[PDB]
Curated annotation (Swiss-Prot), chains A, B:
Function: A low activity DNA endonuclease yielding 3'-hydroxyl ends, equally active on ss or dsDNA, not active on dsRNA. Shows no sequence specificity. Upon expression enhances RecA-independent DNA recombination 49-fold, concomitantly reducing viability by 88% and probably inducing DNA damage as measured by induction of the SOS repair response in RecA cells.
Domain of life of the organism encoding this protein: Bacteria
Organism of this sequence: Escherichia coli (strain K12)
Family: Belongs to the Rpn/YhgA-like nuclease family.
Residues represented out of the complete protein: 244 to 289 of 292
Name of the protein described by the UniProt record: Recombination-promoting nuclease RpnA
Encoding gene, per UniProt annotation: rpnA
Taxon lineage: Bacteria, Pseudomonadati, Pseudomonadota, Gammaproteobacteria, Enterobacterales
Amino acid sequence: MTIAERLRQEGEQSKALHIAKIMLESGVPLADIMRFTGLSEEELAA
Amino acid sequence: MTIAERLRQEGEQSKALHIAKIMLESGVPLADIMRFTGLSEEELAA
């Protein structure tokens, strides 16, 4: 891919992690966080 | 800002909209979608 599409992907990953952090603090079930954000369990752990 | 940080911001906005769309289909209350994703009501409408 291009550098622009790589930078957009970094932003998507950054936003998904931030949303997941909020959901974690609000008590959302972890299986739902993974469904909504697309993140792996090791991404949630780190 | 720089072009890299603008491109990352476009990715963050794209991912927030996608997550919001999933949450909408799953019946999440709209006030919660807005809290988790940071989106405005007009961003959810469009």
